[PDB]
Amino acid sequence: GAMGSDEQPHIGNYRLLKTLGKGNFAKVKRARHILTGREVAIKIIDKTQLNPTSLQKLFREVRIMKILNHPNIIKLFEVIETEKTLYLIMEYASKGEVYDYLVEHGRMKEKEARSKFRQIVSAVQYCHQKRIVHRDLKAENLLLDADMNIKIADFGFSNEFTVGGKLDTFCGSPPYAAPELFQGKKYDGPEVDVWSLGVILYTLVSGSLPFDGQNLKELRERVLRGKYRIPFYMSTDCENLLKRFLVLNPIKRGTLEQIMKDRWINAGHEEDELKPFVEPELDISDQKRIDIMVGMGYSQEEIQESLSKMKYDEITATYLLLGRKSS
Amino acid sequence: GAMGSDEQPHIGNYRLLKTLGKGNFAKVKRARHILTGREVAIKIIDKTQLNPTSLQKLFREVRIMKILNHPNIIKLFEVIETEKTLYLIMEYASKGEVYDYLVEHGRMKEKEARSKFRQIVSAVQYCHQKRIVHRDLKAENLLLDADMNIKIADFGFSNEFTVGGKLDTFCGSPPYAAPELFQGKKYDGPEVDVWSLGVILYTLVSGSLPFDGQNLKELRERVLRGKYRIPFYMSTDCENLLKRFLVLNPIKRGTLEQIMKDRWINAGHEEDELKPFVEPELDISDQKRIDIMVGMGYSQEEIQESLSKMKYDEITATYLLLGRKSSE
Ligand SMILES: C[C@H](c1ccccc1)N1C(=O)COc2ccc(-c3cnc4ccccn34)nc21
Ligand code: NI
């Protein structure tokens, strides 16, 4: 029920603020953790409308969210579940979609594009290492947080539980689709995402899509032809890197691990060559945060049990949120 | 205890020196930290004169100082409080008000104006990050330290605890006001500060105001028309930058995050583009300073305890002051 007088609604330990987007089966709201003051996004999924396959899908998608732990992939902090509703407490990326940002402010200088594209490549390679391929990239998958860091959203999930939902299924994906789709060839390997990453890099450095169609038919023709315009300001090294991604034969595209050695990717990072991401082991014995949580009224044995099992309960969420920047 | 009949008095660990200014409810003095020798400013507020809501304004403004931790914003070092009096120990900007400097020396060359305006834009955008919008940004908020670095004072504050008469807040603010002030609508968004930042930029590079008049009607006329002189010496890039700030329609006024990318803002900083300020984590583990404080008589335990929570007490003040340039 009501938490405080004349206050916003809550769910668990979170104050629910503005709705960011609403869909068929899911809503997303901005929210503030009551205990720590940290800002979060909460995806709200009505379970009463889902059949068993939808439910079992939803469950394993949530489990994938728990497995993926990368600085540029939207991170899960807490799960709250009622009989009728599942709430997923996750990172909030205040600056919205990358392609919307590029439309608004124009192309990124190559230095800034390199910064975001290193983040994109690292995150997607890490998903590929874990055998998660998306094959459905669109602008919605790429977000920016308040520090202009890339946060990849919904990678490897179905759009059944997005705010676009079943209705907007096709609006955003054709510009990123690999030519194998329209040739009638297989469309399930990481090569597909590699092509899409080439489209993404083009949009970062040019502000535009490399294959632009007045409709589905013209977009298909350009994708199958594989030719795209090199702008006068684009560096030769950038142009050569695009050649690693936008290859018509999927067998001849470079793997992401190979492309990580590319010259343009590593300009300005001579002693910092991009390499496959290695998860650090999570520190679950930060006595400073543990003591704060005792102060919040949790017992140290409760804390130890929640962290050691990684339950995505209210304690592990607090501990993780205490490790992030406040306000 | 006393310091002697003909010596300057002390409060806590500070010797009280010359008065910089006095207001209805506050006095500001230059002071010297006894333990480190560092120069500071002390704001002395007589609480016995304050009703409870003026008291809360006072405490609100203290909270704001503790929130704002930026190298071009006046920083709080220590709080001393009795039943009757509140002492706020803070940074001292030994070169005074930007307004006075401009009048004494004339306009800054664009290279020197650029270094200051980067500091100003950084500080104000940082304040906006903290959801602190001033809406009274004017020359009196802008001070200079010994190294000619900008230090912003009173951002987010009322006038209750400033120096001068009660009717001094209005002296400097109209020429910096956004045109929305004169159109009967809301006057509360970050865009208001953005407009004032354009006026500030103009005064740095020209030495005068872009909008003026001999009364409020005349000033309103000039602000609403939005036109202003471009001096012969002003670069085209500086002129183009001013156009991002001094836009009549607040909806179309440039945002600070995008203005930080401007060519003029970044000339001579090509590899070091201006970006939203990122507050670093305070280093509380500098053993060189800790060891110096044990030599003063502080125990290592009490130092550890005072620094773990930001206490604004004698210990944290000493630690921070040891991190600043010594007196010369
Ligand atoms: C800005 C202004 C003021 C006070 C006295 C004289 C002139 C202006 N002020 C206030 O109204 C109240 O709050 C303050 C707190 C600190 C400082 C300050 C720090 N360093 C310097 C160096 C020179 C002058 C002032 N200051 N000034 C103010
Ligand atoms: Ni309730």
Describe it for me?
The structure is a homodimer. With 327 residues, the first copy, chain A, is an alpha+beta fold. Chain A folds into two domains: 125 residues, Phosphorylase Kinase, domain 1; 171 residues, Orthogonal Bundle (Transferase(Phosphotransferase), domain 1). Chain A is built from twelve helices and nine strands. Chain A has a six-stranded antiparallel beta sheet with strand order 1-2-3-4-6-5. The longest helix of chain A is centred in the middle third of the chain and has 20 residues. Chain A is globular. Chain B: Belongs to the protein kinase superfamily. CAMK Ser/Thr protein kinase family. SNF1 subfamily. Chain B: It is found in: Cell membrane; Cell projection, Dendrite; Cytoplasm. Chain B: This is MAP/microtubule affinity-regulating kinase 3.
What's this model, at a glance?
The PDB classes it as transferase/transferase inhibitor. 2 copies of one chain form a homodimer. Helix content of chain A is 37%, strand content 14%.
